[model samples]
Every structure is written in C-alpha cells, then in structure tokens.
Target chain A: PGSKPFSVPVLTVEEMTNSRFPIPLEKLFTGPSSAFVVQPQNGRCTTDGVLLGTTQLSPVNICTFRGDVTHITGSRNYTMNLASQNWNDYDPTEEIPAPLGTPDFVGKIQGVLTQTTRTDGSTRGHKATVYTGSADFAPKLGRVQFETDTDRDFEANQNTKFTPVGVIQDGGTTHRNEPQQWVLPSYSGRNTHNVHLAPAVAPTFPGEQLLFFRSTMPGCSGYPNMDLDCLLPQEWVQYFYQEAAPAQSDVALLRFVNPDTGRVLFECKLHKSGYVTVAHTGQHDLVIPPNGYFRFDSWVNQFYTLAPM
Target chain B: PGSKPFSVPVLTVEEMTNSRFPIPLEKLFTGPSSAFVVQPQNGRCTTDGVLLGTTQLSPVNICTFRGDVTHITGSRNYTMNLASQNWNDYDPTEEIPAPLGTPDFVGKIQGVLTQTTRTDGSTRGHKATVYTGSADFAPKLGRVQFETDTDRDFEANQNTKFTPVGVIQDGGTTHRNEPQQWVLPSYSGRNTHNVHLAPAVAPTFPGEQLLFFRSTMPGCSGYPNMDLDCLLPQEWVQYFYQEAAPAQSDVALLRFVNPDTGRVLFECKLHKSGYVTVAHTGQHDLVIPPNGYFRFDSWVNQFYTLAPM
Candidate 1:
C-alpha cells in the first residue's frame, strides 16, 4: 500500500463515463464560501441522493457540515480519514494543529485510508459536519451512517469492503412550501435512460429552470472538446442564453439529449428570463455542443411540449 | 419575572424613523434558511460596523452562526437569556429537550430575563451561534463579547448597562478579490449626517451602485407614507431603474439625499447595468419618493461628477 490521496472524476458520458460532485472549490472553501453543494454518493460511495433546494425551489445535493470550531478559519483544522473511515478531529485525544492558509488547509482534513484501528479506547472518533445549510435544504452537521466489514448498502451490494464512506444525505426531501408544493423529480423514469454517465435519476421543478451547456463544474472533470455541462446555478444557466441574440429558430427546436441513449432532457428554447420549465431531469451529465442546441434524431419531437414525461 | 418575547423594528425615517432588519423572515427561518443578516447593533447595540460582501462585492453585516445540531431542526432546541447574559445550552447540566416545529422553535431559544444566578458553576452558558456564513463573509459561531455590568460598551457608553448583544461583524472586511480591490466606507464624514435615525457611517464601492428609493430594509423601521429605502441589494437598486423607460432627464440631475441635512449622496443617472461606483458614503437613511428621484435643492451642483467625496 502506498500513501496516496483520492481523486474525484468528472462528468463524462462517452468512453469514460463517470459523474462526480462538481461544487466549485473557490466558491466554497476560498471566496465568499457562503454555501456549497455536497453530494454524498459523489462517486465516493454507491448511493445517489438529491436534497432539493428550498430557497430557489431548485435541486441541490446536500447534508451539510459543522462550521469551523469558533472562528472564521476553524474549518481549516479538521480531518477526514478514508483509511480509518472517519472525519473531523476523529480521535479528539490526538493533537490537532492550528489553522493554516488555503493551500495547506486540505492536507489537515484528508488522511491515509487505513483498515486498522487501535485496540485502545483513547482513539475514539466522532462524525464531521456533512451538512451546512438550513434544515429546509439539508440536515445540519449530519452523520454518515453504516458500519460493517461486509453486507454494505453501497459498493455492489455485499462486496467493496463497505466501510470507507456513506451517503451524507438520503434521497427524498423537498422544501418548496409544504405538501402544497413539491418536485416531480426524474429518478423513476422506467423506460427513459441516461446516456451521459448520469445516475439512474435526477430532480425536476416547476416554474422556470434551464439547462446550461459547457459550463465547468467544480470537483468534476470534463471532456477535451465536447461542450458538456453537468451542474448549473440559476444565473449561470441564464448567461448562456444572454451572450448576444439567439442563434436561430432551430436552436429552440433542438433538444439537449444524451448522445447514445437519446435521453431527451430539455428543449433548447432561448428563454429571455433565463428560465424554462425543467420538466425532465436525467443523469447529471449533459452532452453540450458549442453550436447552441442539437437535433439528436427524434428525441427533440418527444419533449417538444412542456408536459410531464 | 414576566415572560414576554422581544421584538425588532422595521425600516423607516419619519416619526417612526427607527429601522429594523427586514430580511424577509419567511425567507430565512421558514424558507431556504440558507443565509441571513445579523446586525449586532441592529437596535440591540450602539456599535455599527460593516462586513463588505465578497461574493457580490456588496456590504453585508456579519458574524454567522452554528447550524442546527444534526437534523434539520436542531436549532429549535437552543436558548438565549438576556437576564442571565447566557446563550444556547447555557447549563448543560439542565435538561435539554428535543427539537420542535417552526413556530415552536423560537420559544426554545428565548428565555425570560432575570437578575439571579446560583452560586454554582453548573449554570454557565455557552455562546450561541451569532455568525453562520464563511470566514470570508463572517466569523462562524462567534462569541458575544463584553461581560459584566456597571461598564458596558453598548447602551450609551456606560449608563445603559448593555449586555445581551455584540456586533457579529466588524466595521471592516471585504470579499471582492484582494486588497487590490475594496470599498471606501463612509463612517468618517464630519459635516455630512443622516436624516433618518441611522447609527453612523455606511459603505462605498467602485462599481455602479445605484441608490434605490423607497425599498425596504429588514429589522429597521420606516416612516409613514414615505418612499425611503435604508438598505438595498444590487437587483433591488436595479429594479427601481427598471419598471419602464426613464421618467425624465431631471432624474439624472436629481439626487438621493438627506432631506433635513441636505447632504447629497448620489445622482441618479438611470444606470442600465445596475452597477455604480458608490463614491460618497453617508448615513444609511435615504429619502425616496413615489415619483423617482428628488431635487432637494441647489445641493445637487456640489460634487455632481463621479469623483469621490
């Protein structure tokens, strides 16, 4: 075994198909750091859940974390042990270091993946903050459950060792208003399929939500040439429609669909308000081309109208 | 001792000139609950400071808070005491209860004021979460400093016996990149003053920050039938410029200024991009009318250009 750090994959659907959590690191750890997206399955585990956004009535991945201990930089001193299967000052008895600058901060949080634990009781570990937003959006400082040598829920059923990770959030919670308002997420489309390395399902909302193409997602990688976009915020989706005038009427008639499976996701309408009824949500990955929208055979005709799929 | 809840005022500048935070309670506690503004002196203290926005390069008051414990509603079980000068689970020895629903949540966090504390260390109260965002935006779960009576920083120097509150944010701190770009806040103007009962100074930036008239500021009071806006976000300031075509050229010449003091703050030039290099900072209060910008007097000619005051 070697001392190596783990790496997350990007959003891809072609030859290499894997979609990882793409929350912007600068936006989360460095800049305003006001809020961030945390996907429990995030390719780390085998679970895929969606914590729908309560504020914007959109979909966000979640289950937040405990804030930094007492000050602004407190988040800098925690620990995440994939080897030991622990996180955040796991063994409190062990000495924790003082806060460091940005470049060196991540080092404090990640530890070697280890299958061994001390027989002594002094090395007791605790759960780290996995959720950080409002209860409406997620569970705050929630736990990462599941413990065993085998019989794990993730990692291909009983195998995969099943100890290093667990989904920080469970898949079914909506905060739009109440039972009065909620989402008709796209996780259960039986006949429908995901081409671009998307999870089995996705979340959908009423009102206005638009799919963006070619935008970079944090923590996730991208293909070399394809203008693909996996995740997007409200404003980002709006900007793609804002750069000058619309390409042509064909752009609207086109659909954003999966390349191989022809899973029609959204109609490429040049929505002025930067909003469209996000009626369908497929796997997070979206195959986007530089030249506006694409025809993709008969996929465009299936989702031409804004009716529920 | 009577058990009554405390209340914050609204934004106003007339006879009811007292302004309170109006951060759309529905938005924070009941809705997304993602973020909120915590003004230390928001009628609670005398010290006024600014935590400039790093994400939007705007001025937001600061010092966030600890999220609810584990579940979404963990916040409902904490407590605050103006009487004991304590917060949260002040005395861990005392039994804490399970979390409650939204309406019942506030009751658990508030306690009656009292002039007594038993002579045992068992009743010590820990600091409640006063700040919640990121280190870049504010201190997370910060403490309310300044202890003991007879000598308090708030409440008019040393007479009012100030305690229960402290500025969650300092008067300085910006998030827009580095020191290479920042704000020139307006708290030091000697002759210049505030017409409405604003605490002291305000903040200024180097972009198109139009002064929105007649909008609302949360936690601040407002005058009767007057179009005054104490604090505003970028979009709000943009909407006033929106609505329709420009009223007239007089709007460009007109200024948003203090009525009684006659201090000219900004000249409305119908900025389209919704951005303005806020030059001169003054008191937080701005007298707005229904008919758009107002020409107070000959004061508009003074510093009519974009140069800093």
Candidate 2:
C-alpha cells in the first residue's frame, strides 16, 4: 500500500429503510391526503424509484403511486438510465453539468418488465397513476410546453428526478436499440473492470483528475419534505477507484446490509482511491440482496476491504 | 380578491424542535464521536444556528457548539445579520446574485453581543469550537487561503453556513460601524413594514418580479446528516407583499404553533405573492409564538390569516 488514511467501525442503517425519500405524488397529495386526478393537467414527479422528466421531450411510461418502482397495471420491467455525467465533457455544446435539480434533457424510459408482448412504444396507458415525468401532456395535441432552467416549474406540477449518480451502469455506449443507451456493465467480461465515477462530478486524481462536484443546501427543495429536487443524496454521491493499482489499493471496504434484517446499516473504510463521500442516509434499495441497485459504496469496491462479507 | 389559489389547514409542529441541522464539528467528529483538537488544522463549518464564512476575509467571533445562538465565554449578546439579497443589484460590480452554496464575498459578522465593556475586535477566541467559516488562520503568519467558487473546499474543513433567508431583518443598508450591516427591521417607527423576500432569490411577481431560487438535494450536504449547506430552508424562504396593495390580499394565513405544542405542524395559505413555498422540515424554533422568527408564511403574513389563535 503506497497511500492510506481510512477509518471504519460504527455502522448501522435501516433508519426507516435508510429514511425513505421520493416525494412529488404532488407533495404526497398535499398530505391530509385524498384524491385529485386531473388529466390534461397531470405532473407530480417521482424519485428513488426513478420516474423523472422535464421534457427535452419523452413521456408516456408512467403508472405508480408509491415507490422502489411500483405496480401500475402490472408486469412491466421498467428500465431508465442516464449517468454518463463527467459534469462537462459529455457536452453536446458543452453539456454534462447536471445537479441543480437536474431533470429534463430527456432520454430513455423503456417499460416492458418482461416483454409482456413487447411494445412499450406508447399511446400512453398502463393505468397511469401519473408522474411518468409530469404527464398532462396538456390534453395532448402535440404538446411542447417543457421549460425548466432547473428550479423546475413546468407550471408547478413540481418534481424532476433521475438518481443513481454513483454509477450503477453505463458501461460506455453503443445506443443498444437506443432509449438513451450506455448499456449496462459494472463489467463482467473476462473478470471485471468496474472502475467508475461519473455523476454530477468527481475525479479526485488519477493522472490528476480532481473535480468533486454537487452542492445543494437550504430547505432541500422545500415544504415538509419537497426532498432534494433532482436527487443525488446517496450519502453524498462520490465513487471511483478504477479497480486497483495505485499502489494496488490502500483500503476500501463497504457494507450496507439489511436483507430485511441482515442488519448492518452502513459500513465504511475508503481512503486514498480518494473520492468516497459516503455518510449514507435516505432512499435505498441495493443490497442485503434486494438489489435493483443503489445503496451506497461506489469506487467499484477495491477488494471490498479483504473479502469475506 | 383577485389572486386566489391558496391552501391551509393542517398545522402543528415541534417534531423535535423543527428538526435540528448544523454539523461540522468536523462532521461532528466523524460521528461515532470522540475528540480531536488539531490547530493549524482547524476549519469545521457550522450552520443554521449560524456562523459561516468561506473567506472574503473576516474571522474572529466563534465559540459555542449547539445552536439558536448560545452562551460563549459567558455573555456577548450575539448580533450577526445579513439578508438584503435581491440575488442581484445590490451589486457593486453587479454583485446581487447569492445562492450556490454561497458563503464567500464575506461582509458583516459583528460580535459584541450586547457590549460587555465591548471589545469584540478580536485576535480570535471566546471558545472557538471552530468554523467561524472554517477557521485555521493557518497557524498565524498573515493567512489568506479562501478559494471556493462554491463546491466549498477551502481545504476540506468544509461548511459554509448563514441561514435565515425568508428575511426577518435588513431594512436597507448603511455601514454604521460595519461588519456587514444592513441594520435591522421588520420595520418600525409607524405601525410596521416587514416585507422581506430575499434569500437566494424569490421575486415571484409584484411588478414582473419572478424568481424563486434555492435547490439542494443529495444526502443533504452529505452523511448521517450533513443537512443543507450555505443555508436557505426556512420553509423555502420567500416573502414580499411589500406591505399591502396587490389586489389587497386574497389569502395569507400562515400558522406554525408548537410553542411547546400549542399544536400546529405547519399552517399555510399564501396564494398570490406567487412564491410561498413552505412545507417546512427540520430546523426550527420559529413559533407557536416562541418567535426567534421563522415558521413559514412569507408574503409577510398578510394579517396572520385574519388573526384569532
């Protein structure tokens, strides 16, 4: 080990499932709670269990009232991906910068859960509980509406989500049949290569990368819990060690557990592969075996602190 | 009654005193908790209960740990104010724009609390738990070091606080004895004025004044609870009817009880000041009537809904 400075011990999460966060069922129906479905006027937002869009254009996929991906009209494997963010070089004209409530550059929203006869194509309707990115295509007629420099206000329907910035898959790019494809890969070809870090911003050195971005503070998006608008709170989002070699790993172990009681809230030990950020809190579902992915610990797990879970 | 669409009913709060937030005792000493002094090494932010500074150069008040402003070497009175913020136009070079983890461009930081033979003209000390804006005047020798276009990394002592955005003061500027003075006022002399709306930008509409800023998401400033940075969460900070007149109030109300459980999690109704934003979560001490001020209502309260409870 050529470099080091790590610490780990006190870990224990399940603080209410790492503290559930994903609001915008129109601020949970303004709470006292009831019902108010207004088509030609839909738009409420969804998070953690994904569902975000401010319209660079691409709607019709919705149908959920609760989270971690729900059951809307049943059987549809939903897959939404975005993270390629280097924060500025994924540029079209210099784009890549996400995180200011980011939502609406639009791309990829497939839903077919298991080929229920394929065709997520869209005429819109699975049961549509709303928030497939603020529906209400304004009563549809070839809608355009969409406008959000990010404070998000495509006319108050609020919310704009698309989380998982600690890298869960982008494996590079090919456009696979295109839906906003970067094509999954924590890598499995000939062993492994995970080595990832591209969400909001983070480089901390590797030939001298140094970037570390993401900063939002103050009433986190507003109201009882407007909860972080465009999402990135997987414990401060930051990861990337690139699978070994920098004196072959100085240390990196990481644990989250809670397979219904597998217990263990959040463990740590990342130092010198620099860039870890984790303090873990809110919005989970990625471990102890649940795994739809996202529970913290990014940097592709350098030997997971000497194996042995 | 021309600008309608306001709502209010549910109210009652004190959920652990609005939910405490303000960390950077070096991330609360990396938490499992311990103690570790470190001098030429100071710098560990502080928030909400205020004490911020990323270095526009001005440090020397510090002393205290818990918040709502505390004891500190016994009695000093503690004044500290900063709120003009139109977000732009208070500008010298054009300097009015605020938020983005804002905490540099330092200005007022007075500390004589209430004059004890008055002499807050410091060499730094009163207790100095640290983070009067990342203190560390680098082991003395005429230190400078400040840099933070905002992702705040003045060398990781991290933290850039300065809460209270939904204005409680700042009746306009003077300089008086300087430390960053906008002076004080909800306004007085005749009846009362109190029309504040400047905390990271909230124009919403009066004379085409439409701007509603403040967005911070992602494990809120990170970890077990890094809680929002460069602060701005008093229910979402926005208030301004400018005294009266915009169609003379369609609805304003705004309750927030819990003056020890007078009950009332949060009451509301702000319709056409166009920017109310209150749903409140964590960080509190504004009402039932305990008043340090800040419970959520904004467009100046319009007559406290009409008054009664």
Q: Each prediction's TM-score against the native?
A: 0.24, 0.21
Instruction: Give candidates' CA RMSD values in order.
Output: 24.7, 27.1
Candidate that would win on TM-score: 1
User: Which model scores highest in lDDT?
Assistant: 2
lDDT score, residue A56, model 2? 12
Each candidate's lDDT (Cα)? Answer: 0.20, 0.21
Off by over 4 Å in 2: A1-181, A185-309, B4-92, B95-101, B104-251, B254-301, B305-309
User: Per-residue alpha-carbon lDDT of model 1 for B59-99, expressed as tens digits?
Assistant: 11111111212111323222211111112332212111111
Q: Which ten residues in a row have the lowest lDDT in candidate 1 chain A?
A: A99-108
Instruction: Give the range of the ten consecutive residues with the poorest summed lDDT in model 2 chain B.
Output: B24-33
Off by over 4 Å in 1: A1-309, B1-232, B236-302, B305-309
Q: How close to the true structure is residue A147 of candidate 1, measured as C-alpha lDDT? A: 23
lDDT of 1 at A167: 16
Q: Give candidate 2's whole-model lDDT.
A: 0.21
